[PDB]
Ligand binder design. Structure first.
Ligand SMILES: Nc1nc2ncccc2[nH]1
Length: 154
């Protein structure tokens, strides 16, 4: 019982792009860009499509960096999130009614205003490590338990 999602982190040498979501699941929190994968669409093509829909940016080179499964207690479907990273993009981040993008210096990533799992695996993403994670949430703020291990192959 799992549903495919994407998450794209535009990660440059000294800064990362994040978006403040206006409404929906995760509203009020900085996050990477992504969403559901469509029928007949590859996960990577879905990640590319969502990056543009939400941030206005066109990615060229995308790299798999992680897989994180999210469980919310009481909700049947697990979120199977395929995480990607890129440095080579085109365009300028676009603010829309749905999303407010902002660049952050790497020592100023706003973990307090992000999903609480991010502080666990971001240190790996910033050091170019690949990972497999699982986070069991109660509600949207409480991590009941988790696993996170590095991998050589996502
Ligand atoms: N970046 C990010 N973390 C998350 N945790 C739970 C649900 C969705 C999430 N998106």
């Amino acid at each position: 019982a799992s549903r495919l999602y994407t998450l794209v982190l535009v990660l440059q040498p000294q800064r990362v792009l994040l978006g403040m979501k206006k409404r929906g699941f995760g509203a009020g929190r900085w996050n990477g860009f992504g969403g559901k994968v469509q029928e007949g669409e590859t996960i990577e093509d879905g990640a590319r499509r969502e990056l543009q829909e939400e941030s206005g940016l066109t990615v060229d080179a995308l790299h798999k960096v992680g897989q994180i499964v999210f469980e919310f207690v009481g909700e049947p479907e697990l979120m199977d999130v395929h995480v990607f990273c890129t440095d080579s993009i085109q365009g300028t981040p676009v603010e829309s009614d749905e999303m407010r993008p902002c660049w952050f210096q790497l020592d100023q990533i706003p973990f307090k205003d992000m999903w609480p799992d991010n502080s666990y695996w971001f240190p790996l993403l910033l050091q170019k490590k690949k990972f497999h994670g699982y986070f069991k949430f109660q509600g949207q703020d409480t991590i009941l338990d988790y696993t996170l291990r590095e991998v050589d192959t996502v």
